[PDB]
Amino acid sequence: AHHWGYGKHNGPEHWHKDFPIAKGERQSPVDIDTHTAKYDPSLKPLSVSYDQATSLRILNNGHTFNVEFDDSQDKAVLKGGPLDGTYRLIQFHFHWGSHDGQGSEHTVDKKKYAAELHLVHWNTKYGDFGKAVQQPDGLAVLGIFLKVGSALPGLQKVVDVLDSIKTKGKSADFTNFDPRGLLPESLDYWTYPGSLTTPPLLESVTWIVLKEPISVSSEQVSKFRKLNFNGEGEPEEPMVDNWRPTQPLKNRQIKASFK
């Protein structure tokens, strides 16, 4: 029937009608309350190893845009922190708002940022992303907040290509992109067990949400909003507000990597 989305009839408040895990015990995103998040001395140092990352292409999937990487080798990986083993970078994408005052998925003390970046990784314990996403320890998503301020040079190559992938299904070559340019200086983070923030909402993600945002310009974020959810020849639906509301923490603890 109708595929899920972010619109009035197919968006987040309705996803449970087809994906009942939406009301599960380990759903994402959540509010991160800084007064109750607790330092966990058992966390090991976090290793973000992106020196050899090979980007390939950028795709408008009708929900967001994904920048895909070659994940055939243990090169662009995340290790340490809360993770056991090695997690390969497969793609990143963003969530953003119809205006700068909303857009992020996670919140910090109920505050929203203009957008949120997700760097998606899968556990090489499993054969590939499709096998990993079915497992509780399968995925690790590095979440980074975008705050409006000065323009980010590391984002400019992304925003420059978006007019070539305006509608669902369009893709373009996207090579030689350095995802380190989308990282803040500090890797202090919060972590908790959660889920994909889109259908099928599987509870297979270890979330690692960095405390320090990256700064982007209002003009850069506005370029995100010129994408469309629809395919060519369908009524125009601007790609905005492609975020899920925060969900109940339930019986989970958000841990901090910092004292």
Whether 198 has a binding-site annotation, put simply, is yes
Q: Is there binding between residue 259 and Zn ion (CB under 5 A)?
A: no
16 classed as catalytic = no
**Which tokens sit at 24?**
């599960």
Contacts 24+ apart (CB under 8 A), 159-164: 159/220, 159/223, 159/224, 161/58, 162/65, 162/223, 162/224, 162/226, 162/227, 163/223, 163/226
Whether 121 has a binding-site annotation, put simply, is no
Closest separation in Å from C-beta 239 to Zn ion: 13
Closest separation in Å from C-beta 52 to Zn ion: 24
Bridge-partner residues for 145, per DSSP?
Answer: 116
Rounded Cα gap, residues 205 and 143, in angstroms = 11
Maximum Cα–Cα distance across the chain: 55
Reference 100, options 224, 245, 227, 229; nearest CA is: 224
CA 173 to chain centre: 21
Rounded Cα gap, residues 27 and 197, in angstroms = 8
Please identify which of the residues 2, 9, 16, 63 carries the catalytic annotation.
63
Write the binding mask 34 to 73 for Zn ion: x where contact by CB under 5 A, - elsewhere: -x--------------------------------------
Closest separation in Å from C-beta 14 to Zn ion: 13
Which CB sits closer to Zn ion, 5 or 81? 5
Q: Is there binding between residue 3 and Zn ion (CB under 5 A)?
A: yes
Binding residues for Zn ion, rule CB under 5 A, total 4
Q: Is there binding between residue 26 and Zn ion (CB under 5 A)?
A: no
Rounded Cα gap, residues 96 and 104, in angstroms = 6
Residue numbers 90-129 binding Zn ion by CB under 5 A: 118
Among residues 11, 14, 31, 33, the one that binds Zn ion under rule CB under 5 A: 33
Residues that bind Zn ion (CB under 5 A): 3, 33, 35, 118
Residues of the binding site for substrate: 197-198
Residues of the binding site: 93, 95, 118, 197-198
Catalytic sites, residue numbers:
63
